[PDB]
A paper describes a structure:
To investigate how Thr111 phosphorylation affects the function of MFN2, we solved the crystal structure of a phosphorylation mimic MFN2IM(T111D). According to the structure, the side chain of Asp111 is not fully exposed, and its phosphorylation may require a substantial local conformational rearrangement. Phosphorylated Thr111, as reflected by the Asp111 in the crystal structure, blocks the binding groove for GTP in the P-loop, and the negative charge is also disfavored for the phosphate groups of the nucleotide. Subsequent ITC analysis confirmed that MFN2IM(T111D) has no binding affinity to guanine nucleotides. Therefore, the putative phosphorylation at Thr111 is likely to directly inactivate MFN2 in mediating mitochondrial fusion. Intriguingly, we observed calcium ions (Ca2+) associated with the HD1 of both nucleotide-free wild-type MFN2IM and MFN2IM(T111D), and one of them is involved in intermolecular contact. Addition of Ca2+ did not alter the biochemical features of wild-type MFN2IM or MFN2IM(T111D).
Outer mitochondrial membrane (OMM) fusion is catalyzed by the dynamin-like GTPase called mitofusin (MFN). We generated a modified human MFN2 construct with deletions of residues 1–21 and 401–705 (MFN2IM). MFN2IM contains a G domain and a helical domain 1 (HD1). In this study, we address these issues by presenting crystal structures of truncated human MFN2 in different stages of the GTP turnover cycle. These structures explain how MFN2 uses a primate-only single amino acid variance and a tighter G interface, as compared with human MFN1, to allow for enduring GTPase (G) domain association even after GTP hydrolysis, a feature that is unique in the dynamin superfamily and ensures efficient membrane tethering.
Author numbering: 25 to 126, 130 to 322, 327 to 400, 706 to 755
The structure:
């Protein structure tokens, strides 16, 4: 019964942990290199640039760790307001989080640990109370500096929703109409959206502007995850026969759109991207169930299960995709950084071994020469030789630790970053 979102949660913690270890390892390496480089008793076995490079990598790794700590899954919802996309988000969250059509901007729902909802617009990080959904709606309408290119974050309490605790963000978009100016949308707000949900009506033809947007999604993102939720499916409660016909036809239209028109999916998983739902039915049932209220429509259990099925296939989709797209570049960077430090330690090991061999040979030659200070001078070179030997041992250990991290990273890649 574990949410598939736990795959993301698990991978995020695992990659953050590796970067913690990578940072610790580079720190130890930097400390070792610096100490070595400052050793005025030896001919140089490392260089300032190697020290600076490894301090530089430490900085970069800590910087990346900060990005990795904040990475989250994002699903973005699109479509006409009248088709109910906001109710789909509300149903998924088991509550009336977003106002539902009678909202200018993008609404980005994020979990907060605080026990009260509030808004954060983004050009100004200034909040607005959102004690109720009506007061939320009025707070957006009150704010006339808002438009369909503004994003407000709806900070919604963690405790109410496990989706939000598992680092899911849910973005509602402005409702689409014919002349909705939306070519800004993908670059400004959707580059990090792991899933795009089109919420449509099974019987209403898709607007050209809606199709145009999902063309742009398919042109701008690499293998974007597109779901089509065909809302108001509860009409099947009273016209099951006609809605079954509608289902077959629209299932085929949506498949052709996803597979042939957009080319973002095979036919084999079309049934996993195209769902027929009744969001407000689900949301109503969930609001009552959350309170222990009892309860109805014909086909209701079937429609509730379909929505739950959508949710599960969505959570599997977003969790697996987001892990891949949001961690793969940093996993690759981490391997490159590990390899850079590995090779410096190998360079140091080798220069220390070469200088050791040199000092051993200087020791043998010293024993061919005058007996004045011979034992003192052989001892000083014995000590240098033993430092060079310890440096080699230390560098080999650090080099093998870099290989360990490469191995952790390879295994993370294998488990979490497959196509
Ligand atoms: Ca360099
Ligand atoms: Ca030897």
């Amino acid at each position: 019964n574990a949410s598939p979102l736990k795959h993301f949660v698990t991978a995020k913690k695992k990659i953050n942990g590796i970067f913690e270890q990578l940072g610790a390892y580079i720190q130890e390496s930097a400390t070792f290199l610096e100490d070595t480089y400052r050793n005025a008793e030896l001919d140089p076995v490392t260089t300032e640039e190697q020290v600076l490079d490894v301090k530089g990598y430490l900085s970069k790794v800590r910087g990346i760790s900060e990005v990795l700590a904040r990475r989250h899954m994002k699903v973005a919802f699109f479509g006409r307001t009248s088709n109910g996309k906001s109710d789909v988000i509300n149903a998924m969250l088991w509550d009336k989080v977003l106002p539902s059509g009678i909202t200018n901007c993008f609404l980005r729902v994020e979990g907060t640990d605080g026990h009260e909802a509030f808004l954060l617009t983004e050009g100004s990080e200034e909040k607005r109370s959102a004690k109720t959904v009506n007061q939320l709606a009025h707070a957006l309408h009150q704010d006339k500096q808002l438009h369909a290119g503004s994003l407000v974050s709806v900070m919604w309490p963690n405790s109410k929703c496990p989706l939000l605790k598992d680092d899911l963000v849910l973005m509602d978009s402005p409702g689409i109409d014919v002349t909705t100016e939306l070519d800004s949308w993908i670059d400004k707000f959707c580059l990090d959206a792991d899933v795009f949900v089109l919420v449509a009506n099974s019987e209403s033809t898709l607007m050209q502007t809606e199709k145009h947007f999902f063309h742009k999604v398919s042109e701008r993102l690499s293998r974007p995850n597109i779901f089509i939720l065909n809302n108001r499916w509860d009409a099947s409660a009273s016209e099951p026969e006609y809605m079954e016909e509608v289902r077959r036809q629209h299932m085929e239209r949506c498949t052709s759109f996803l597979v042939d028109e957009l080319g973002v999916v095979d036919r084999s998983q079309a049934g996993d991207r195209i769902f027929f739902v009744s969001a407000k039915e689900v949301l109503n049932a969930r609001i009552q169930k959350a309170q222990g209220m009892p309860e109805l429509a014909e086909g209701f259990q079937v429609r509730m299960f379909e929505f739950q099925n959508f949710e599960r296939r969505f959570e599997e989709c977003i969790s697996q995709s987001a892990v891949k797209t949001k961690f793969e570049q940093h996993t690759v960077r981490a391997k490159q950084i590990a390899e850079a430090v590995r090779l410096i330690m190998d360079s140091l090991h080798m220069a220390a071994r070469e200088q050791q061999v040199y000092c051993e040979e200087m020791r043998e030659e010293r024993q061919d020469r005058t007996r004045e200070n011979l034992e003192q001078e052989i001892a000083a070179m014995n000590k240098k030789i033993e430092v060079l030997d310890s440096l080699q041992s230390k560098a080999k250990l650090l080099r093998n630790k870099a290989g360990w991290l490469d191995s952790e990273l390879n295994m993370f890649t294998h488990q979490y970053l497959q196509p």
